[PDB]
Design a protein around this nucleic acid. Structure first.
Length: 59
DNA sequence: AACACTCGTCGCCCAGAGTTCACCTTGGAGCCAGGGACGGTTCATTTGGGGTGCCGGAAACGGACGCGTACAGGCCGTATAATGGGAGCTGTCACGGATGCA
């Protein structure tokens, strides 16, 4: 079923697939990153603002 | 069936058709001689006329020259939330060989 090495190897072998169609391959590759929410996006904005400010300072 | 009359045909004889043969004239046909005027030529004028190169300049005219306007195309931004495609139709066969699995 779910545990005892039952379907994890199936998921791994599924992810290790050619997927010769480029659109399907792109969808597979885009599938590996989780969605965000309001909090995560706002602190990401804080981080990029800090990076831009530091880059301007070094310039 | 018996009986007593008038008409082509030819020759011949004399005069001219018109034709030839053969005689005198006279208007020549042209041949040349002489004299214009004449039209073709040439050369004097004769100033009536064509002519002109350039310009003051007046006006067109061709274009430059500077400066406005005009859409065409390009860049740019829109703050609720909106977080993984439809569709494709696929009856071949031969068959050599690689090829992903045996």
């Amino acid at each position: 079923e779910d545990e005892s090495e039952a379907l994890r190897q199936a998921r791994k072998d599924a992810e290790l697939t050619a997927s010769a169609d480029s659109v399907r391959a792109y969808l597979k590759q885009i599938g590996k990153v989780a969605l965000l929410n309001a909090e995560e996006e706002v602190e990401l904005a804080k981080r990029i603002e800090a990076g831009l400010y530091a880059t301007q300072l070094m310039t």
